[PDB]
Design a protein around this nucleic acid. Structure first.
Length: 64
RNA sequence: CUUGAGUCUCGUAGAGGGGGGUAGAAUUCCAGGUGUAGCGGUGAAAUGCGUAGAGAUCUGGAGGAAUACCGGUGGCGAAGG
């Protein structure tokens, strides 16, 4: 159940808009969000979703 | 003699040969900036590499082969070339 917590107010860089980069290879996909002026705000992968084998290089493991 | 072959200047098509000059782009690398955990490999897998901060990504520099497409049943070289 609910607790009496203070209000949240935090800032990081508030960029509002970005560019994304997709590096597709033969064994994996690497998917990366950045700011438009060019700084990484996070990434994920298809290999870290743990499909492994051929199943690791598919449109669906890449989507997730 | 020309009926074999040879030769002059002219045009034409082409990756024939030797030496010069030249650019950008991924891997790769370095530096700074941003940023967190896999990256790689495969039939499935593990060795490698990585928190000293990798992988990727922004900016800028580095370096060496190579130069795809146009390249086509094309064209060229003495044959491979």
């Amino acid at each position: 159940a609910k607790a009496p917590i203070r209000a949240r107010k935090r800032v990081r860089k508030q960029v509002s808009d970005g560019v994304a980069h997709i590096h597709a290879s033969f064994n994996n996909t690497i998917v990366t969000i950045t700011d438009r002026q060019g700084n990484a705000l996070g990434w994920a992968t298809a290999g870290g979703s743990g499909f492994r084998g051929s199943r690791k290089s598919t449109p669906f493991a890449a989507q997730v």
